[PDB]
Structure 1
């Protein structure tokens, strides 16, 4: 390509058919290249055979995410502001049931807008702003309206840094191809200087402006816009102005104190969102580390070190090419970023970190399943992109004889095991349930697997739960309750509208879901593991790195020779994970409502959204639609003519879109060709078709329009199924 250059046009390329592999989009017309162009639009086997740029693009086309997450948030802060309900909800929590969005009464619309709290028509929320927002050491609607434009500021600017890259004549190699410092910085002072900084604006301002909110008032009968400077006088109620101490150290006297923190654990009676008196200390006690920690270092050295006998000789030298990969140092990350998201999903529901959550049921489970699909949707990826490594990234083979060349050495092996693992599971991990049916429908309970028939006896208790809620008696200092109230030992009194967390008991019907997870988590990974491992060569095809990591299927021979590849192992690996997460969700809420969520009154006689129906009745896998799907969902199929209605009214579409995927999943290809011409014929008679040769779907595009649909179908189905059984009773 010209047009023409090198050097010697500014005149930009708008006009002249094509670009992207060289007997390119050819003069001669076609359609396939219009899904080409969008797909693989980002890729790197083309653009140039030379690293250089690519990192100079990804550090820019990156940017436009932050900026975006930044245009987003703004319409959420704005939204969570003038489309109010926040002002109204906060003087009045336990009571309200929040909104931010509202229609405009065009056509049918309005049904969707149904009285939500501080006196107005709207559609609800299961996205816990209104609750980060508890923070506001200040309060005010127009104020969020500054935090809002403060958002659009970071954006335009944190979006003109993206002009101020690639398009501007760019940095180069050394800049990233000296890695030497990167984490040094990152973790030290941002990971640090945020958490740190967050400390300073987490007791300064917030703690006090909810220390005396957890009582009454109406805001501006509290927390001015400046009030919190030098005036270290209201900081007087929430500890000393250090009195006689000077910059910690010890020649200090406490005859009666010990700074803010004074460590909690449990839950505010009046706002059980976990205590804040702590929340500063923990973030402070973070940062320090990061503050000390981001001070390594300059790199091989540490990895060029510990080897052994069978261990990893190539451990030593574990990648020069880890300054020369991406597709590698992205895949690693996704496993972590991803696997480090759904660890949120627990510490959240068994330890709320915001005021008013749990009581708020629906506004932190939405969460625990949204955060849950990322700690999964980012993991199969975290494999895909390793397959993208394993196939291609490096120039030649300069990488040699090491940890990997090792793992591969065995490979019909690491995956030889893992397999049997799964059929051991599955048999012990699902037909287990099927016993029950076949023998409870035969009907002889003597011999089921009930929490009571097969020998276990009115106790689960003695394991580690019961040595967690009881541990404030070790090296442990203490502080009433535990760490997470859901643990075996002691305490009850949690909240005065509805409930929050309490013990959460186990045994079987907790024993075996917990095991289906195993088998589910395991056969997921089998297919990804073997998939990324056998990326490039095999004894079904060895001539098998020769195009890319996709390729439809090699060809009718060898018997099958179809699925193979690794786009496709990252195609049938999604297919499982949709279950992996989709059944983990199914788990939590049936627990968390069967027990936990429920409610106090006199003598606090607890009354769960369901008197533990779980008991003897999830163990039957029909009980999973006797007690679940057919029981709850009665709220989705009753939901017409209401306010939420948009869920029942989705629940048919998307419970349709899924049942459209199979068409894309289950079908041939020269088929819709053979068909597309009958069409093309009738077209030509009137004189109406040929130009831009209309073509069927690109074997693997077809699979691309399976899967993606099967998910946005099979998923939102419950996104509806859910929001419709926590809004309204529960």
Structure 2
């Protein structure tokens, strides 16, 4: 370390066994430290006992994400370009069924490459470029081929800002350890100056270049590469060059107008992607705020303020150490970032924001479950990293007697409640279904819980849905339809290939899933809540912050003394959430196809991918493999010899990989030792082993190779199960 510290060598450290705590990787050989090294590679209890750097690394090794997201996207714009189908698909939507990727016909490959639209062999897409891409106030294949290198530009450069940190002799403390302004900036002008800037390049150019696309043409029979300058003459069709107004204000006359916007709500008949005549106004109406907003402020003051009786004395002082944490100001974030992603996953499917979605079924549910697993994979995290706080981050105990020191005060308490909450749920929240089986398999419907047997009567309606689609008669101005076409009141006519959204009815078989979610969302959180709370000390172990937030398990005593910790609460809390999301998905498509998705023809006699089979028959939790899993999936297990086939052909692996997790999840440890030697023996006889003491998995590594597999198994299983029942009918 020790090596040359000094002052006295540019000469870099390539060669001399080890580094990472101090009777380190020792001279003496071993393997464990090769999963060490990668694991905990990023961490901070080592590197130095002194903040300083760390924030000087994380602001750099951050960077290389943007740059990456940036090398990525490029190979997607390039891809969504010269491996074309976008040109072809756009003159010809409702019709196509898009591609970007294609094999090369090496070995078996080609089956994977199967006629997708504007006349070519390839593998489809459920990742709605070709639909952000509607945008292109321009169109052209080589063009995206500029947007593309425009991408690699931001990268190399927005990747030499990461040389232009840590490796360059760095900023320091004040720079972040004065926080005083940060959000001031961020939200004001980027949050703002994007949404803002996005406005300017969202009616300028895009609106017009799909105002007269929503009809016909073949591009360049429209939208030149410059055309949209000073020429405010084509902006003539889509409202005035302000005619006699000057910089809004009022001494304005309308005997017949009101600038672009003229607010919509509903859905283009010919392109139901929601109206764009709005899409400017809403982004404009954003930015303003941010534009005004990012103009606080300088900190404590506002939190150093409102206290009460039982309230939070420490509210006041809610962390000096919120300029001195990270692990704290990351975990907070993840809960939001994360919880603020799966709020996407709704406003999307019950309010499409891109031209051609809904009709495009599979190219926005992929979405609504990809976005859905982040608004969850980022939340258990958002707990883990709080545990990482709760255990260690600060130097000593300087933080004292406050909102927390409070919450903890009760702790065998906040989690005392929550518990019973769950068993109240569960009993009202799952055995509920099991009634049905036991009594519908007993069979007496009189007494089930059907949308019709237990008292509810051919209506759901009177709640709040029915006071949403109907609200354009309040303080409400209006604009034909609602806000989200899926609401109770009025309207039908949505689309001329297939369908899109319509009411979406409820009652029971909507009533009780909606409740299983409760109990599922709740017991998830119990285990993370109590997990992060009891982070450091307890009446099973108090001497219990003494290593780190991991540690395998304290020891055979006290009865059990194993799981405890909170790596592990963030190990069995993943375990749930994989359900939390994995059953919410299961919900949406079985609805969204049992009803909604389906299809018009004469007299628009609606014909769902399934005549609402849901009805009386998800209520039975077998119906959930009678009507689901065994019904759909018949497309997965038919999928051989085709074009997609890579799904069925995954769906066996990964429906294997999962069923390999249990081995990592379910087993001892001096076991594979006791085994690894028999091995090590046979090894020595030929003279072939010892060097680098081969060793079994690091108790908790073992759990690391559970879980992670159990998910990348149990998950892509459906990622396959899905793309295979929306491609092809649906």
Q: TM-score range by the shorter chain?
A: over 0.9
Residue matched to 1:153: 153
- CA deviation profile, 1:532-591 (whole Å, cap 9, x unmatched): 000000000000000000000000000000000000000000000000000000000000
Gaps of 5+ in 2: none
Aligned partners of 2:230, 2:329: CA distance in 1, in Å?
Answer: 47
- CA deviation profile, 1:120-141 (whole Å, cap 9, x unmatched): 0000000000000000000000
Aligned partners of 1:294, 1:418: CA distance in 2, in Å?
Answer: 38
Quote the offset at 1:3 in angstroms. Answer: 1.7
Quote the offset at 1:366 in angstroms. Answer: 0.1
Residue matched to 2:280: 280
Aligned partners of 1:48, 1:575: CA distance in 2, in Å?
Answer: 34
Aligned partners of 1:202, 1:497: CA distance in 2, in Å?
Answer: 27
Residue matched to 1:617: 617
- CA deviation profile, 1:576-616 (whole Å, cap 9, x unmatched): 00000000000000000000000000000000000000000
- CA deviation profile, 1:621-668 (whole Å, cap 9, x unmatched): 000000000000000000000000000000000000000000000000
- CA deviation profile, 1:44-99 (whole Å, cap 9, x unmatched): 00000000000000000000000000000000000000000000000000000000
Aligned partners of 2:297, 2:535: CA distance in 1, in Å?
Answer: 35
TM-score by length of 1: 1.00
Residue matched to 1:176: 176
- CA deviation profile, 1:302-336 (whole Å, cap 9, x unmatched): 00000000000000000000000000000000000
Aligned partners of 1:299, 1:427: CA distance in 2, in Å?
Answer: 47
Residue matched to 2:420: 420
Aligned partners of 2:102, 2:299: CA distance in 1, in Å?
Answer: 54
Q: SS where residue 376 of structure 1 aligns?
A: helix
Gaps of 5+ in 1: none
- CA deviation profile, 1:12-66 (whole Å, cap 9, x unmatched): 0000000000000000000000000000000000000000000000000000000
Residue matched to 2:190: 190
Aligned partners of 2:448, 2:182: CA distance in 1, in Å?
Answer: 58
Quote the offset at 1:6 in angstroms. Answer: 1.4
Aligned residues: 730
Quote the offset at 1:457 in angstroms. Answer: 0.2
Quote the offset at 1:7 in angstroms. Answer: 1.1
- CA deviation profile, 1:97-136 (whole Å, cap 9, x unmatched): 0000000000000000000000000000000000000000
Aligned partners of 2:313, 2:529: CA distance in 1, in Å?
Answer: 22
Q: SS where residue 660 of structure 1 aligns?
A: helix
- CA deviation profile, 1:495-541 (whole Å, cap 9, x unmatched): 00000000000000000000000000000000000000000000000
Cα RMSD (Å): 0.2
Aligned partners of 1:417, 1:214: CA distance in 2, in Å?
Answer: 56
Residue matched to 1:558: 558
Quote the offset at 1:148 in angstroms. Answer: 0.1
Aligned partners of 2:608, 2:712: CA distance in 1, in Å?
Answer: 32
Q: SS where residue 368 of structure 1 aligns?
A: helix
Quote the offset at 1:698 in angstroms. Answer: 0.1
Aligned partners of 1:635, 1:52: CA distance in 2, in Å?
Answer: 56
Q: SS where residue 681 of structure 2 aligns?
A: helix
Aligned partners of 2:437, 2:362: CA distance in 1, in Å?
Answer: 32
Aligned partners of 1:639, 1:61: CA distance in 2, in Å?
Answer: 42
Q: SS where residue 3 of structure 1 aligns?
A: coil
Quote the offset at 1:461 in angstroms. Answer: 0.1
Quote the offset at 1:397 in angstroms. Answer: 0.2
Residue matched to 1:509: 509
Aligned partners of 2:592, 2:611: CA distance in 1, in Å?
Answer: 12
Quote the offset at 1:718 in angstroms. Answer: 0.1
After TM superposition, the structure 1 = structure 2 runs for residues 10-409 of structure 1, keeping only pairs within 5 Å, are: 10-409=10-409
- CA deviation profile, 1:422-472 (whole Å, cap 9, x unmatched): 000000000000000000000000000000000000000000000000000
- CA deviation profile, 1:183-230 (whole Å, cap 9, x unmatched): 000000000000000000000000000000000000000000000000
Aligned partners of 1:645, 1:511: CA distance in 2, in Å?
Answer: 37
Q: SS where residue 515 of structure 1 aligns?
A: helix
Q: SS where residue 348 of structure 2 aligns?
A: helix
Aligned partners of 2:243, 2:624: CA distance in 1, in Å?
Answer: 62
Aligned partners of 1:709, 1:472: CA distance in 2, in Å?
Answer: 50
Q: SS where residue 549 of structure 1 aligns?
A: coil
Aligned partners of 1:567, 1:205: CA distance in 2, in Å?
Answer: 51
After TM superposition, the structure 1 = structure 2 runs for residues 701-712 of structure 1, keeping only pairs within 5 Å, are: 701-712=701-712
Q: SS where residue 15 of structure 1 aligns?
A: coil
- CA deviation profile, 1:252-274 (whole Å, cap 9, x unmatched): 00000000000000000000000
Aligned partners of 1:209, 1:125: CA distance in 2, in Å?
Answer: 24
Aligned partners of 1:576, 1:421: CA distance in 2, in Å?
Answer: 17
Aligned partners of 2:556, 2:5: CA distance in 1, in Å?
Answer: 46
Q: SS where residue 142 of structure 1 aligns?
A: helix
Aligned partners of 2:54, 2:163: CA distance in 1, in Å?
Answer: 15
- CA deviation profile, 1:326-373 (whole Å, cap 9, x unmatched): 000000000000000000000000000000000000000000000000
Aligned partners of 2:451, 2:5: CA distance in 1, in Å?
Answer: 77
Aligned partners of 1:304, 1:205: CA distance in 2, in Å?
Answer: 48
Q: SS where residue 148 of structure 1 aligns?
A: helix
Aligned partners of 1:525, 1:182: CA distance in 2, in Å?
Answer: 31
Aligned partners of 1:394, 1:288: CA distance in 2, in Å?
Answer: 38
Aligned partners of 2:345, 2:145: CA distance in 1, in Å?
Answer: 30
Aligned partners of 1:648, 1:166: CA distance in 2, in Å?
Answer: 46
Quote the offset at 1:481 in angstroms. Answer: 0.0
Aligned partners of 1:621, 1:169: CA distance in 2, in Å?
Answer: 61
Aligned partners of 1:442, 1:178: CA distance in 2, in Å?
Answer: 69
Aligned partners of 1:140, 1:409: CA distance in 2, in Å?
Answer: 64
Aligned partners of 2:163, 2:8: CA distance in 1, in Å?
Answer: 22
Q: SS where residue 653 of structure 1 aligns?
A: coil
Q: SS where residue 420 of structure 1 aligns?
A: helix
Aligned partners of 1:7, 1:295: CA distance in 2, in Å?
Answer: 46
TM-score by length of 2: 1.00
Aligned partners of 2:6, 2:138: CA distance in 1, in Å?
Answer: 58
Aligned partners of 2:729, 2:245: CA distance in 1, in Å?
Answer: 53
Aligned partners of 1:196, 1:2: CA distance in 2, in Å?
Answer: 54
Residue matched to 1:469: 469
Aligned partners of 1:542, 1:712: CA distance in 2, in Å?
Answer: 36
Aligned partners of 2:325, 2:251: CA distance in 1, in Å?
Answer: 54
Aligned partners of 1:244, 1:720: CA distance in 2, in Å?
Answer: 58
Where has structure 1 moved over 4 Å in runs of 4 or more? Answer: none
Aligned partners of 2:438, 2:300: CA distance in 1, in Å?
Answer: 59
Quote the offset at 1:167 in angstroms. Answer: 0.2
Aligned partners of 1:719, 1:6: CA distance in 2, in Å?
Answer: 54
Quote the offset at 1:8 in angstroms. Answer: 1.2
Q: SS where residue 662 of structure 2 aligns?
A: helix
Q: SS where residue 721 of structure 2 aligns?
A: helix
Aligned partners of 1:537, 1:505: CA distance in 2, in Å?
Answer: 49
Quote the offset at 1:2 in angstroms. Answer: 2.6
Quote the offset at 1:5 in angstroms. Answer: 2.7
Aligned partners of 1:727, 1:667: CA distance in 2, in Å?
Answer: 40
